[PDB]
């Protein structure tokens with residue numbers, strides 16, 4: 001698997017047309033805020049491709 | 051997309067905007083294609 005390609009499965013809003021997003025920011029998947037630290041309901045949105 | 055309009059208005063006023071009519075002619079296009087929500091101008095300085 002060539003793991004050099006990534007994608008953003010998790011975010012808050014859907015982008016407007018012709019927009020780019022390369023930022024590496026955490027997202028909250030539940031009632032527990034992340035605040036820059038991983039844990040429950042908190043995942044890194046960029047995942048490599050196998 | 052992006053558009054620039056400009057016009058060299060000739061004035062002899064003191065403080066406020068002039069009274070009269072004059073339109074601006076487009077000059078430049080520059081498609082950066084990013085999130086633009088603010089802009090800032092430049093002010094030069096001088097030293098005695």
Ligand SMILES: *[C@@H]1O[C@H](CO)[C@@H](O)[C@H](O)[C@H]1NC(C)=O
Pocket residue numbers: 016019085087
């Ligand atoms: C532009 O940035 C603001 C905050 O910096 C964000 O709320 C907004 O969704 C962004 N818009 C686009 C089109 O990227």
